[PDB]
């Protein structure tokens, strides 16, 4: 009777269904899957991509920048909302292959530098290759790429290091104010009394407060259906999206019935 | 004329200043120097250290374990409280000739892996050799090491990772709430405004409150003086040394006075 | 139609096949699987432990370590072949678990660093958690534990960090001379016009040269069958191993064969 | 009696002396000061940069930079020569304000890392901010910038992680081949038995053989007075300039008489 075998992290097959890049304002677009979320932002002194997908991806989004015109030397910057193997799988090959640099705080950079292994809650089943950052943040610090200035909002709970990104785009030349927030879920953590995360709690629901007071008219998620989005049908893509404000509410809602029954 | 000769990091003299280890519980000592605090802790299973001050000061505390019993191969962990040249200085030195794991903050952990350089407010001015953390930390978790348990409380300000230590030990058979708290400083910071920093007067109000109601019936400092201590009195080191309380409420009131003064 | 799921690392039955620690010589024994060798060595100051195998068999060393009376904390140093995943895999859990430190080459310790991903051949098809090394380890520096003495012997090809390791032991006193040998196989490479690798020939041609020489009165190889070595048959389990030119020889005739037929 | 205060590593007037841009080749300039010698690369895609020299040069270097139509965003790639203070110094610096990518082998890798500490030969003595590599190189690998070729030749002795490069420009139209070779001197290192590089005089000796054999044209050197360069007098500067046969003869001469005397 051995030892079992190593199982790989598979996921939904929507997951991994290429789609054509979508227009979100005049330089935002999304360029990931139906259901996974990828940002491009083009400014006149490069590209900026928030997160990725999963590892498996990256020859796709390098599909998706050629065709607007984004050569691979272009993209300069990569941000990301957290570090799972679902939104940071294929930032190490995207810099091997684009000469960008990634910028993240402490806790995501150190989580990324391990590949995602050791999680806190997934130990090493849920791993990817590793990658480093390059610059550092701080909460609250202003990424500038040309002109268009990316403000970090800390949001821990999904992941120590979890980040909100906020940013003001146009809409034929009206601006719209783009907030691109991370996962508020838990799904299967332990909240209380973790030993790994002994303040979890208390670090969800300051999360929730600074959700609901994000400067936003349009709400992003990593994972599309959170903030009620549907890629697949293009135009009305945003039709029934969330507010901030709902998106939170959801949230802390699902987030108490979950720690209702744990006590049971 | 050419470029200018770099400058090496000179402090005061009783910061280099030998000393022997001074008691301070049943298994706490004092084996830094005069105006050095580094804290061994020796268990059944090994000792802890905490701090271990300037670069140069490897030897010296590696000749005070000696005199405590304590070979180089039982120190079976560092602990830190910010990682500043006059405070983890020797800390890569003391890996290398010990083997021992050292446990920080994500925080603490990006700053150690640099020795220091592109610090928020110093930038290289202040380096030291890089050492990597091997356990990261979060806030409230218990680290135990030979049946004492070491709790870790956040502290954000002098430095983003900045860090407080709180273990019970025993004086002659009875409990001592021992408490290591770092500093509440800012020599010469900018307060205001910051661009490195943009929440720093946020986090400093928060970390004035955390010390204020941390669990301590004895307050130990990095530097002594900061909580009253004369370590070259000997046995009366403690005699004048300040609560928890006090310490806080001397800190928040020199940030304030700074903080007036910058407006101006 | 979407993008490929990932798939694990898959491998035979029999390297997953627990097996009671095995003795080799007074100090010497193999505690990792049937097809899988990890040996340790227990000397007055602590164990030393040379490769660990597939990531899943952190619990199962641990508990052969604990047969031998050797305790977590007693374990002070990992050594390594190289850094593919059948042989580093639980170098990360084990560090967390036992304090030890780790000892490579520079070679080693970067691909050790980013968890083998990226991989000259492999690319990131075969992945494990990362580690750091704590010492590097230059050709032919002696690393000493508890007063066995370890040598290094560079051997580039199967990965540019390969390394073997020398060291003698005592079979009831009587003085035997020890050398574990890495793979000298090249399973897929491309060999000829390697751009990854521009001069891999010539490694290999150097590093059969290096394992003749090496001084060895018993041969042992990371896995087993690679030097005739029957770990199932316990007392006879060295009875058919070669010897150092043996296996060199072996190595070169099917290396010069595999490169006949690439020029094909 | 206190311990010693910490000194600076202070180097010769001229090596910190500003100098305009000194043109090379058609796209090859020498942009660091009179005595260190910092090489621009100027491609139709962007711009090369190896070695840097003293950490205090990063300003001097992008002002140079600026003179030659290099924007910091146009600064592709950093090579290096060998990662010691007075050559690499500035890298951290320079990856943060033009966000390039540094590629280097895995010796120099782990010694940039960690900022030149723990040096085989200066120990903690001369070191800088560390930095990181982004992409590891093997020995006769090629790195192709806008259609520029450059090839890593390996070159171990003053460190384990020496570099030469070659490459190929053009006079006018007409080609020459441009060789960049590390130092060959071993300043007050231990040659015989030294532990921490136990075969230090066999890596030596064949390093000269590669030099001798390098595809060169023109040769220059990390500092300038060793391949007889005078970047004071201009257009004058390569007249004097040795060959490889030259420069790697009267290497061998010293390194012989040093390992004689060595003995004595
Ligand atoms: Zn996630
Ligand atoms: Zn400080
Ligand atoms: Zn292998
Ligand atoms: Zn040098």
């Keep these: ?25 005049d330089h935002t ?26 590892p498996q991806m990256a020859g796709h989004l390098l599909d998706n920048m050629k065709l607007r015109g984004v050569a691979p030397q272009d993209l300069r910057l990569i941000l990301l909302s957290h570090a ?11 810099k091997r292959r684009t000469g960008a640099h990634v910028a993240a705080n402490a806790e995501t950079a150190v989580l990324l530098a391990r590949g995602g292994s050791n999680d806190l809650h997934f130990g090493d089943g849920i791993t ?9 943040i701080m909460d609250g610090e202003v990424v500038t790429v040309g002109g268009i200035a990316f403000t970090a909002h800390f949001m821990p709970g999904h992941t120590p290091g979890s980040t909100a990104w906020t940013w003001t785009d146009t809409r034929d030349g009206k601006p ?19 030993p790994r995360y002994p303040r979890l ?35 009305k ?12 509410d959801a949230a802390e809602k699902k987030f108490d019935a979950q720690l209702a029954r744990e006590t049971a």
């Design 128 to 136: 990817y290759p590793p990658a480093s950052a390059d610059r550092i």
């Design 237 to 248: 893509a945003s039709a029934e999206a969330l507010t901030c404000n709902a998106y939170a």
């Design 29 to 54: 677009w999304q360029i990931g899957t139906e259901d996974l979320t990828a940002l491009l932002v083009q400014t006149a002194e490069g590209a900026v991509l928030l997160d990725g997908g999963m």
């Design 176 to 194: 719209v104010r783009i907030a691109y927030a991370d996962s508020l879920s838990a799904p299967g953590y332990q909240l209380k009394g973790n």
């Design 1 to 25: 009777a051995p030892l079992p075998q190593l199982r790989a992290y598979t996921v939904d097959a929507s997951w991994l269904q290429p789609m054509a890049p979508l227009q979100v304002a």
């Design 201 to 235: 709690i208390e670090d969800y629901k300051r999360s929730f407060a600074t959700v609901r007071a994000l400067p936003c008219d349009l709400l992003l998620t990593p994972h599309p259906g959170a903030s009620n989005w549907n890629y697949a049908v293009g135009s």
């Design 84 to 94: 799972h193997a679902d939104h940071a799988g294929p930032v190490a090959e995207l």
